[PDB]
């Protein structure tokens, strides 16, 4: 397939060829043009707080070691020995000053440097240039309020710029709340879906909630329980949708601070969020303080998603076109009481973790939609994302980004797929920029 020319996503993001969820050649192409190019979630400060702490993480299909340095910075390296390519680290987390390869015993520092080689003098003499044999380093590693992202492409925008208009929406919870912590370890489960299926669902899909999660809504009696079975449409002005230049987007559901959590947590959460909101009105203004305690369903392009207030944090780690390894963490506000942090973490896993009854509701939807992308009569068919098209705005006086001023729509799908298509058809960041110079005009046509 010729990715320069092939229209995989139609103008304004209105539709996508179903083959994008099934085509293995495209998946290989995404490794280059999506995963090697863009910012990918690695870890949080809270998981590697002390010098020598490390975790392993995926970046696309690659595995990296993410290590806290002595100077307090974080560096990330390929989890691959520079000698004959064995995987260096076989655990998920720990603390160490370095990593020794189990094949021939080469020793690398926490800083990636080749520090020791067994019997170097007797074997290599002075001829091994260890200075050139450090682990292959992830070019860019930046933090958004403790959340650590990596990018293999030195040319990428700074992470803050990459978040674009989405950052404004995240800051009340990520910054002004006093900060978040990631509670590990994550749940890990493999689903037979393309990574884009859950990515699009979290970015933009409030429409499915009432019908897909009918059973979970009714059974848990969470705050949004009135939606069960499409019994009730959220009211006028119940929320909004937004999207951004580099693909990130989210839904905003006003005031839904207890999120997916069953009735056993609702009163405590609604109290906690309201109390902080009252303090934040004075500091960041009423609208932003309200955003703090509103449920944001967000995808940080390409494959990191979250539900703020619910406290769900997801990585959709790609394996192949119909295989994804789902990592599920909980996020909590640092200043919550510890017992509430513990219960909130359990509740995240209860609802959307490996045995998450809500997330089970989504399995067949994601898996079959992805697998149908392989079926002959569907490859060239069009997935529709036109809901709300021609009612989006840009440059609003209050809410930044391309914005649909309604709780339910496909605004965020369109921005996600516009960004996707611009990357897939471009060879580097400069070309993505050229392809994106009229991004918001494209999204707000008609």
């Amino acid at each position: 397939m010729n990715y320069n020319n092939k229209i995989l996503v139609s103008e304004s993001g209105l539709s996508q060829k179903h083959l994008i969820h099934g085509d293995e050649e495209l998946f290989q192409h995404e490794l280059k043009t999506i995963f090697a190019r863009n910012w990918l979630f690695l870890t949080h400060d809270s998981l590697i707080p002390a010098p020598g702490d490390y975790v392993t993480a995926k970046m696309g299909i690659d595995e990296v070691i993410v290590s806290r340095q002595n100077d307090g910075s974080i560096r990330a390296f390929l989890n691959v020995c520079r000698h004959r390519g064995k995987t260096l680290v076989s655990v998920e987390a720990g603390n160490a000053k370095g990593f020794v390869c189990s094949y021939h015993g080469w020793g690398f520092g926490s800083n990636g440097e080749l520090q020791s080689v067994p019997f170097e003098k007797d074997l290599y003499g002075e001829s091994l240039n260890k200075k050139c044999l450090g682990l292959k380093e992830v070019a860019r590693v930046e933090s958004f309020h403790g959340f650590i992202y990596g990018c293999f492409d030195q040319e990428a925008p700074p992470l803050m710029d990459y978040l674009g208009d989405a950052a404004w929406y995240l800051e009340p919870m990520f910054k002004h709340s006093g900060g978040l912590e990631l509670v590990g370890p994550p749940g890990k489960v493999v689903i037979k879906a393309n990574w884009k299926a859950p990515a699009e669902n979290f970015v933009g899909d409030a429409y499915h909630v009432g019908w897909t999660h009918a059973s979970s809504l009714r059974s848990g009696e969470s705050i949004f329980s009135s939606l069960a079975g499409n019994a009730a449409l959220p009211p006028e002005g119940a929320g909004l949708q937004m999207t951004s230049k580099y693909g990130s987007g989210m839904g905003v559901l006003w005031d839904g601070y207890s999120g997916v959590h069953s009735a056993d947590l609702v009163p405590e959460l609604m109290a906690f969020g309201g109390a902080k909101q009252e303090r934040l009105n004075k500091e960041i203004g009423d609208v932003r303080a309200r955003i703090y305690r509103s449920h944001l369903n967000c995808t940080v392009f390409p494959n990191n998603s979250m539900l703020t207030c619910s406290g769900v944090f997801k990585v959709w780690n790609p394996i192949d076109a119909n295989t994804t390894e789902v990592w599920t963490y909980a996020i909590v506000e640092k200043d919550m009481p510890e017992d509430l942090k513990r219960r909130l973490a359990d509740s995240v896993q209860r609802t959307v973790g490996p045995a998450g009854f809500w997330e089970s509701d989504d399995n067949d939807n994601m898996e079959t939609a992805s697998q149908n992308g392989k079926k002959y009569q569907s490859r060239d068919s069009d997935l529709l994302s036109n809901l709300g098209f021609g009612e989006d705005v840009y440059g609003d006086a209050v809410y930044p980004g391309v914005v649909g001023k309604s709780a339910i729509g496909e605004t965020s799908y369109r921005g996600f797929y516009r960004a996707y298509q611009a990357h897939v058809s471009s060879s580097n960041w400069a070309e993505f920029e050229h392809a994106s110079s009229t991004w918001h005009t494209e999204l707000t046509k008609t």
Binding site: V91, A214, R218, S262, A345, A355
Partner: protein
Amino acid sequence: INIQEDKLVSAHDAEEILRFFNCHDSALQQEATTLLTQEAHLLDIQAYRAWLEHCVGSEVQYQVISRELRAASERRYKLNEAMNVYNENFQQLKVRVEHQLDPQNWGNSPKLRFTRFITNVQAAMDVNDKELLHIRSNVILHRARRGNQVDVFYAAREDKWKRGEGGVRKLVQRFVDYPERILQTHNLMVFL
């Protein structure tokens, strides 16, 4: 067991061995075998309300953990070692049962098929609480659905059962440390 000599054995596992090696009460192993076979039968036919009513104590803790992979020699890194796939009280189990029984649980049509295999049953009365029965057993749980989806789960269960209403022994704690770190079964939405 001396865990200084048996270097691979956890303190927890050594404690649980001691419990069963000590009094063997053949009749108790038989009662436990019955309790667990009947529980697995109720679950296999998806009689989830019957399972709650007949098998699960009001004070239950139903817990399945997933432990992060750490170095055998790790001694410094100290953060949360595990997450809870399940950590349910009776009400939380009831929520899950209602979710299974809801006629808009689309994933339950066509009906799923469950088959459980319970083995290696051991039973011992608690030393300090004469009414608390410790039961250990292993399960293979086979779930089939949608024509060609087949998921098989493997686990050891550390249970406590106690007599409740009507003198019926009911589950008051189940603990499973799930052996597979990355699940390859789509989800763990089964009652182990």
